[PDB]
Structure formats: C-alpha cells, structure tokens
Short mmCIF file of C-alpha atoms in Angstrom, two decimals:
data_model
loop_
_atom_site.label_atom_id
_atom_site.label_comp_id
_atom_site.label_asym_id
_atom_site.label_seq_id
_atom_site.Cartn_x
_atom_site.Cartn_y
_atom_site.Cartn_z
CA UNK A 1 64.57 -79.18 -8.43
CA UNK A 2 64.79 -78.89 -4.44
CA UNK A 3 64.37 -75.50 -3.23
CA UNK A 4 61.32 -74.87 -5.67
CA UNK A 5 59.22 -77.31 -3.67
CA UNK A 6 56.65 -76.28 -1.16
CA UNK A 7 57.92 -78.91 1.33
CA UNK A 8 61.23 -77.13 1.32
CA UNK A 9 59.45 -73.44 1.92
CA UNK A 10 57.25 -74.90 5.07
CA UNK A 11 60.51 -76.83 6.34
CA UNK A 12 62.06 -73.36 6.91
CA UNK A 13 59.16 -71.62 8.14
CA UNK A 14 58.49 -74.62 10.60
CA UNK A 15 62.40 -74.29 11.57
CA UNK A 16 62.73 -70.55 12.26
CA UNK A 17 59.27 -69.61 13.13
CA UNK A 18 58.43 -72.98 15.42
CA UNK A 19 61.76 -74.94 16.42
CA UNK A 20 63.76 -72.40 16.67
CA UNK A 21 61.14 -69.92 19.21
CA UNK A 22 60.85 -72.88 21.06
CA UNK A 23 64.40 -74.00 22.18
CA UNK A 24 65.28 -70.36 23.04
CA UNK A 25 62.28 -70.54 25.11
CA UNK A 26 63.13 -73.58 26.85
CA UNK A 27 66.30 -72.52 27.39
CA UNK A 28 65.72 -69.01 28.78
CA UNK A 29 64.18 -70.19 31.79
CA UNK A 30 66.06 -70.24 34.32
CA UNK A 31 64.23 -73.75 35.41
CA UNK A 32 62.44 -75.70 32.87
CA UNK A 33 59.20 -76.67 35.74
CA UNK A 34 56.34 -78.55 33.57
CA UNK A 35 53.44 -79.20 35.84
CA UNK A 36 55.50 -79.12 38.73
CA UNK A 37 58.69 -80.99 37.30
CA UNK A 38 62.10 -79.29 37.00
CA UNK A 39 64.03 -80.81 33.83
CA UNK A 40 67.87 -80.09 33.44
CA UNK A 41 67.52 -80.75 29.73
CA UNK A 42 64.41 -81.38 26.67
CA UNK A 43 64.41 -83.87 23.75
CA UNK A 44 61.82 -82.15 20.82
CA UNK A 45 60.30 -84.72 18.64
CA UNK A 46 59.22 -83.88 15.59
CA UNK A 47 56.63 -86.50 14.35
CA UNK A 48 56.27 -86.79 10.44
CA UNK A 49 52.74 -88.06 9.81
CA UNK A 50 53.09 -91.57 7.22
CA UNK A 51 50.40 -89.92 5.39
CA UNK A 52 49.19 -85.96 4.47
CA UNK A 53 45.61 -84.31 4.71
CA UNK A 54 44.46 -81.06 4.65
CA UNK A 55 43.94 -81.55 8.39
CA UNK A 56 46.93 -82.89 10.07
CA UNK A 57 45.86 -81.08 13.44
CA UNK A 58 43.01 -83.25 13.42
CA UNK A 59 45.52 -86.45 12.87
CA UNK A 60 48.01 -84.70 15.40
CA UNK A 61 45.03 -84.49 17.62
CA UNK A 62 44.41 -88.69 17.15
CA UNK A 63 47.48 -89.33 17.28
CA UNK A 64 48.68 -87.93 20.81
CA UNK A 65 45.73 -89.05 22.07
CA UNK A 66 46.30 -92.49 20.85
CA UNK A 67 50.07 -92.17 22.99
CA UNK A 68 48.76 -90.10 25.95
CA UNK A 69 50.84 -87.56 25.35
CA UNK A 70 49.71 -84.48 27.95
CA UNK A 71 49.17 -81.12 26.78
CA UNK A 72 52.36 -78.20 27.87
CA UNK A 73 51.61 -74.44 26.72
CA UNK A 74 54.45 -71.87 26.42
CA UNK A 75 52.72 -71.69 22.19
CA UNK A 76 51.68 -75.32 23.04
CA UNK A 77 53.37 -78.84 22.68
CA UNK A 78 53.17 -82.61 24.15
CA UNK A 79 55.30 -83.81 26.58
CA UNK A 80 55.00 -88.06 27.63
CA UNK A 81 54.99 -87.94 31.46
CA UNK A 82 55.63 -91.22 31.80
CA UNK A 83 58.91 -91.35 29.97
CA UNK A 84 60.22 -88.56 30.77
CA UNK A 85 62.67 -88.42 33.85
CA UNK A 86 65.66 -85.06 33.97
CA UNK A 87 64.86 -84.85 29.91
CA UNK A 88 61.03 -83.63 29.26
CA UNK A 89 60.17 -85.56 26.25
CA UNK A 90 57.83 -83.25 24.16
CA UNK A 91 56.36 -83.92 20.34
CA UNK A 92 54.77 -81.88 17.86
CA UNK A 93 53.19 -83.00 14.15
CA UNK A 94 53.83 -80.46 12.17
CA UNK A 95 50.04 -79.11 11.22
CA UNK A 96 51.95 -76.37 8.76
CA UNK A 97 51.95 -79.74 6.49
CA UNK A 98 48.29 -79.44 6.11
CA UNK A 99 48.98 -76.62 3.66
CA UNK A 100 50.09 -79.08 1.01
CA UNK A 101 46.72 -80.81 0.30
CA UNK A 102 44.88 -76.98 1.21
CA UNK A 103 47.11 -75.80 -1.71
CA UNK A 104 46.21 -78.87 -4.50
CA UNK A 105 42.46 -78.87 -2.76
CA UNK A 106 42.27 -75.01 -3.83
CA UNK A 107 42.54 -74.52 -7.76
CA UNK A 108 40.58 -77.74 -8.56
CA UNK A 109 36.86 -78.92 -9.01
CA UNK A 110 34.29 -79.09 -5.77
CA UNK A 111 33.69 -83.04 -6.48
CA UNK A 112 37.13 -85.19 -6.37
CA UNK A 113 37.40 -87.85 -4.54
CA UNK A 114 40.93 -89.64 -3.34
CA UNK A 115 43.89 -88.87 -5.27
CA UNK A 116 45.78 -89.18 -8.47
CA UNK A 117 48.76 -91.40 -9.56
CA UNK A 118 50.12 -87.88 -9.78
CA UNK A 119 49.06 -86.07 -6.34
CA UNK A 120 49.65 -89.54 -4.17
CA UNK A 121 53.93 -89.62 -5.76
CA UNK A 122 54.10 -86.16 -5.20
CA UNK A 123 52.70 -86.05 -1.43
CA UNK A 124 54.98 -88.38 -0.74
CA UNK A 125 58.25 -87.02 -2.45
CA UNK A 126 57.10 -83.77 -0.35
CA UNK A 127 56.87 -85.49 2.97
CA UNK A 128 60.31 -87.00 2.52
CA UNK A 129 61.99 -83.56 1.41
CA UNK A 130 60.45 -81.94 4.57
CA UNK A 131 61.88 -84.83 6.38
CA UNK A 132 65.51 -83.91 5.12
CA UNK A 133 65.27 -79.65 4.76
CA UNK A 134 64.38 -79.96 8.87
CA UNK A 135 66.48 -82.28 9.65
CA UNK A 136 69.90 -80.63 8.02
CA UNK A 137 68.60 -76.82 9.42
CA UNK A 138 68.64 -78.77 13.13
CA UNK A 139 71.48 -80.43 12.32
CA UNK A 140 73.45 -77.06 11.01
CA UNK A 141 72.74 -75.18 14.40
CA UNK A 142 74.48 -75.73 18.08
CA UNK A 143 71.09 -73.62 19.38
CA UNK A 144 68.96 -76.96 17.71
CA UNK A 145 71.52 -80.19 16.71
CA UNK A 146 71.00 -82.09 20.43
CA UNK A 147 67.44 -80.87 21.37
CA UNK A 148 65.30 -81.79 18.17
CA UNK A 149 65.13 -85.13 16.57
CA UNK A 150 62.83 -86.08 13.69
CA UNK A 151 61.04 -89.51 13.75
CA UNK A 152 58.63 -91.36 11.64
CA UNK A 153 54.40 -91.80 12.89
CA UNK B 1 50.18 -75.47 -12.11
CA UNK B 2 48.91 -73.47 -9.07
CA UNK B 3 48.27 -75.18 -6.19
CA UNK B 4 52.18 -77.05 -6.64
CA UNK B 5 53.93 -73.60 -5.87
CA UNK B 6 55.44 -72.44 -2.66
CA UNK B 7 53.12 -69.39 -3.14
CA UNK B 8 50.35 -70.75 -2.79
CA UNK B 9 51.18 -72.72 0.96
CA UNK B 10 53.25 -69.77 2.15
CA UNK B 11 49.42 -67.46 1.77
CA UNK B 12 47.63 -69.99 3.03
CA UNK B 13 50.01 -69.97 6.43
CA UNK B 14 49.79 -66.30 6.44
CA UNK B 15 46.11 -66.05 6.00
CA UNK B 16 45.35 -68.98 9.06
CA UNK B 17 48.55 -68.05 11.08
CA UNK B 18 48.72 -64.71 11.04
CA UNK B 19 46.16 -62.57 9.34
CA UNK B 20 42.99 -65.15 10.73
CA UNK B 21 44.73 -64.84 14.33
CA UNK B 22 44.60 -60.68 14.47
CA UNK B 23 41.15 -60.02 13.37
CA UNK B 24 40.11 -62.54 15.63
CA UNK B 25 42.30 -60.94 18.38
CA UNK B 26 41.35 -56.94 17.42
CA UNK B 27 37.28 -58.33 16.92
CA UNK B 28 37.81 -59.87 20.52
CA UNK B 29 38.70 -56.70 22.02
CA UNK B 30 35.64 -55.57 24.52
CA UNK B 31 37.28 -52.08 23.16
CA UNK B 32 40.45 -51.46 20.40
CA UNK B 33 43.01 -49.41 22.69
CA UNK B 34 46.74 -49.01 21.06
CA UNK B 35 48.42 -45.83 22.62
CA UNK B 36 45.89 -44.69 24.72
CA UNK B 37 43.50 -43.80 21.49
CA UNK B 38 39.76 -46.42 21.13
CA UNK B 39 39.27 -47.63 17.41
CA UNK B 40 35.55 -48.48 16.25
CA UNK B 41 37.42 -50.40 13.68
CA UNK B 42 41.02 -51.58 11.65
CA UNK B 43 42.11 -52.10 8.54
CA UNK B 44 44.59 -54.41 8.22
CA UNK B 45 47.00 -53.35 5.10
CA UNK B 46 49.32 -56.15 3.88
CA UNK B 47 52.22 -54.77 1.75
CA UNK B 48 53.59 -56.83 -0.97
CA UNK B 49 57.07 -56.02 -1.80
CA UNK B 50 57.88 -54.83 -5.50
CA UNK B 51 61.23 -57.43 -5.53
CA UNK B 52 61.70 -60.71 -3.41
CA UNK B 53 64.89 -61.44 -0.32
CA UNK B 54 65.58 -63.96 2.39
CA UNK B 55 65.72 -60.80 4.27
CA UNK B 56 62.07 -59.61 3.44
CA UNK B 57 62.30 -58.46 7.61
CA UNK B 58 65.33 -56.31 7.11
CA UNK B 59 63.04 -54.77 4.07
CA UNK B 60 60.08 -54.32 6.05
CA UNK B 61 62.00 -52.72 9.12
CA UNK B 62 63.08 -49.95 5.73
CA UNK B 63 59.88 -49.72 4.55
CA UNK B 64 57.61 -49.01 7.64
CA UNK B 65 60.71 -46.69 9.18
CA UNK B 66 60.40 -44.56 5.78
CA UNK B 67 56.83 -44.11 6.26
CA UNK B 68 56.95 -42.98 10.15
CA UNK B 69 54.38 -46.66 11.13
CA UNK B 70 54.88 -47.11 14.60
CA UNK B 71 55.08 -50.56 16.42
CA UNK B 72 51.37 -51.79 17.71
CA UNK B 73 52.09 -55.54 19.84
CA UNK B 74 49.03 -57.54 20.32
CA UNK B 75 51.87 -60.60 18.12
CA UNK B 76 53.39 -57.54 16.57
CA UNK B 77 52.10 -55.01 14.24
CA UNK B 78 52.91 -51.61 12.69
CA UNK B 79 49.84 -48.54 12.68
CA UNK B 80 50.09 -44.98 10.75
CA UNK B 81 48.84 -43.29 13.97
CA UNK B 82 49.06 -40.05 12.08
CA UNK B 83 46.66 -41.13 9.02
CA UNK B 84 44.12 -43.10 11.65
CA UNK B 85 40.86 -41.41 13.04
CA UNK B 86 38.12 -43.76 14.41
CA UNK B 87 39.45 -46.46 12.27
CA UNK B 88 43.09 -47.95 12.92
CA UNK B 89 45.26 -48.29 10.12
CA UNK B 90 47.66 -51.29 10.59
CA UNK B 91 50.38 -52.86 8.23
CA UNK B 92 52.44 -55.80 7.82
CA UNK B 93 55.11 -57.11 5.41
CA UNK B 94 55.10 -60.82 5.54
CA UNK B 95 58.46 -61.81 6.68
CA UNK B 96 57.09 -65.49 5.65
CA UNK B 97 57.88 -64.41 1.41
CA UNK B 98 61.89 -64.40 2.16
CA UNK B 99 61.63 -68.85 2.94
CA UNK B 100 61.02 -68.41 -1.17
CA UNK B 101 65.18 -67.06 -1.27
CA UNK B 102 66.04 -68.75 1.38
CA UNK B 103 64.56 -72.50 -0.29
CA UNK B 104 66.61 -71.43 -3.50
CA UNK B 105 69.67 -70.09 -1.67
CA UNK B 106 69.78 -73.82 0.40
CA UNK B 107 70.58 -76.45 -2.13
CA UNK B 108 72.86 -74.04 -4.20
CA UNK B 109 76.65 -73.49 -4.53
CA UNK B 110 77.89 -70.61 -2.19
CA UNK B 111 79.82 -67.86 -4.80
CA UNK B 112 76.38 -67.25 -6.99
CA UNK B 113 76.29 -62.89 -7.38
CA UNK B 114 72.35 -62.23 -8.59
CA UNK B 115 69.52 -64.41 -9.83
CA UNK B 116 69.48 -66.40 -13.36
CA UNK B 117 66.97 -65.48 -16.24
CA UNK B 118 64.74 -68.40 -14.59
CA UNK B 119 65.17 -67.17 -10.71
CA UNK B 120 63.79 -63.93 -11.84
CA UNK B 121 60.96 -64.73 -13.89
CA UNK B 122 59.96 -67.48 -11.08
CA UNK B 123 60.16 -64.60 -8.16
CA UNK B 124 57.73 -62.16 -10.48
CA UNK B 125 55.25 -65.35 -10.76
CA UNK B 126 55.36 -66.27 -7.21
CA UNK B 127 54.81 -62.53 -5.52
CA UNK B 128 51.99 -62.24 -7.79
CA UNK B 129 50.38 -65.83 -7.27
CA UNK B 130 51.07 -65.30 -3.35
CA UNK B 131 49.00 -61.99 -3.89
CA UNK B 132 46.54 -63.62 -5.71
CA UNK B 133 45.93 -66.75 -3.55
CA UNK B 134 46.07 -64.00 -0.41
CA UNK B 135 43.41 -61.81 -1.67
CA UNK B 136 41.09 -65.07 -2.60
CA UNK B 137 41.38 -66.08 1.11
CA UNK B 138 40.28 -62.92 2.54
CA UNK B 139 37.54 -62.55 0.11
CA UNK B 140 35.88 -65.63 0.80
CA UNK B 141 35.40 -65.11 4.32
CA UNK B 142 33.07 -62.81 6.53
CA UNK B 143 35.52 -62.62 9.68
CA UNK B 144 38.74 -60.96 7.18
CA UNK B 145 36.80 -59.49 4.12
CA UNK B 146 36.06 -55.91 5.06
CA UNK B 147 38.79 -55.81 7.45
CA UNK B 148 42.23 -56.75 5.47
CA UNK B 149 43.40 -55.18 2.25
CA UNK B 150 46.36 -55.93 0.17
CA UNK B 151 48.42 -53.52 -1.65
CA UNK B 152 52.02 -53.12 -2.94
CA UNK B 153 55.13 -51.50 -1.96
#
C-alpha cells in the first residue's frame, strides 16, 4: 500500500529536488564560508514537525525562531551558530508537507472544523512514511548517507 | 477519494513551486527580454504527457527537441520563438509527475517487465486528476488565470 501514498511522492520530490541540490551545492564550493565562517564539513537536519497543517512554513517559521536558528541563503536554510564549530549545523522543516492538509482541505465543504477519526490516523501514518521514504533515499546515496540526518520536532 | 491521491499534492507543488514562482518572476520584469526580442505578454503552456515514467525529464527533453522549443532560463523554461509575436509562448513538462513511478517502482521487487491491470488504470486516473486539480488552481486565481494554460502531449 506504500508507494500509492502522497507522503511517499513528496519524500522523493523533497529528496531529489531539495536534499539532493543542496549537498552538491555545499560541496561544490571550494570553501563552505557562512557569514564569514569556513566549515570543512555540514550536518543537514531534517526536522519532521509532531504535527501537520496546511501551513508548516508558518510552524517552520515558530519553530526556528523558538531555537534561534539564523537564516543562510544559497535557496535558503538555518544554520545554529552557536553549535556549530568545523561542521555548520543547518535545519530545514519540510514546508512541501503542507500539501497534505492543502490536498484533504481542497475537495471538501468551506465550514469544517478540526479533524476526523479518519484524517487525524491518516496524517499521522503519512508523517511516519515520509519519515522512512527520506530517510532510506539518504541512506541509499554516498552523495547524502553522512550529511543529512532526520530528527523528530 | 480526491484529496488522498499523490495527484492531487504533486499539482499543488507545481502550481506554488513552480508555476506561482514564474508569473510572478515574468510579471516582475520592468520589461520581458529572452533572446534579445521584448514580450508585452506569456503564455505559459503546461504539457501533460499522454502515458506516465520516472523519467518524465528524459520525455520532456523528446518532446520539446521534436517541436524545435528552445531553452528560456529565468529557473528554466522552453519558448516556440518561431510561433511567438508580441506574446511569448513558453512550455513545460512537469518533471515532478515521474515521483508517481518512481513511489511505485520503490517498495517493489526488482525483475517486474510493465505495469499490472491496476498500475495502469491508477496512472490514467492520476494524469487526469493531476490535470484536473492543476487547471482548478490556475483558475481560481487572478495572478496565473489568463497567463497559464494546460494542454496534452
């Protein structure tokens, strides 16, 4: 029944169109200098929110505010400062996962509030699957296995 | 039952990642200049293809080489120079349609020639629904209604 689900889909995309441009970026510079700091090596942690909204930028946005996580553009991505020595350690919420409630939301009636038994088992049966599609594409490339890990909100 | 499928997320990421980003970027423009020519206006023609592949990119790179579209970068996009006057005439293929193969292909056993009865029938209800979904998108908004049609192969 895996491989039919959304979660799976947006796992991939996320992957190749996200994790994936950003490690070959990172490691095509010839020095990786963030705000004036030259890192030998980057850890990219992927942050799986513990609950999905149509607006998980929003929650991103809360969330690395919350951790004062700083703002580092190549697109963009967080990177902690403060713990972050030769290894830059930069985050990212996935706001692709936003697309899940969009999806449901669209194809139902203007009024509902909160969520059925239903919607609430699937969200998080999807969240989990993401979890595991992302983690075995990083884990099945040498370009992605050591530079990517995926942790819990 | 809509709203569940793949489908349905993967248009919704093409319509805010990718189709939402270029009107805003072409509309931006204090003038449209691609090759030296200035464009009043675009269309933006979206090409569904008639069968579904992971490799919905190596079918694209076919497609808009058989029809003599050259490359326009703004990220990337293909123009009929030929059949464009005052108006632009741009395409793309969404290379986002193959993660539907590629979902099925993962978390499947490696020998398997072709598609089952099911496989098929699911691909046909998918291109359609992600056509569907697509169109809805652009028609409910002022900044991609006039400017982005969508069309088959």
């Amino acid at each position: 029944e895996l491989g039919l689900l959304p979660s799976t889909v947006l796992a991939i995309g996320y992957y190749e169109n996200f994790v994936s441009t950003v490690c070959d970026a990172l490691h095509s510079l010839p020095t990786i200098k963030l705000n004036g700091i030259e890192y030998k090596d980057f850890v990219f942690n992927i942050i799986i929110p513990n609950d999905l909204d149509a607006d998980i930028k929003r929650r991103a946005q809360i969330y690395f505010k919350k951790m004062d996580i700083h703002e580092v553009k190549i697109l963009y991505l967080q990177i902690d400062e403060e713990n972050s020595g030769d290894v830059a350690v930069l985050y990212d919420m996935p706001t692709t996962l936003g697309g899940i409630d969009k999806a449901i939301e669209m194809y139902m009636k203007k009024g509902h509030i909160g969520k059925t038994s239903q919607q609430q088992l699937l969200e998080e049966r999807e969240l989990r699957n993401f979890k595991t599609t992302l983690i075995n594409l990083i884990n099945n490339n040498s370009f992605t296995k050591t530079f990517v890990k995926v942790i819990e909100e």
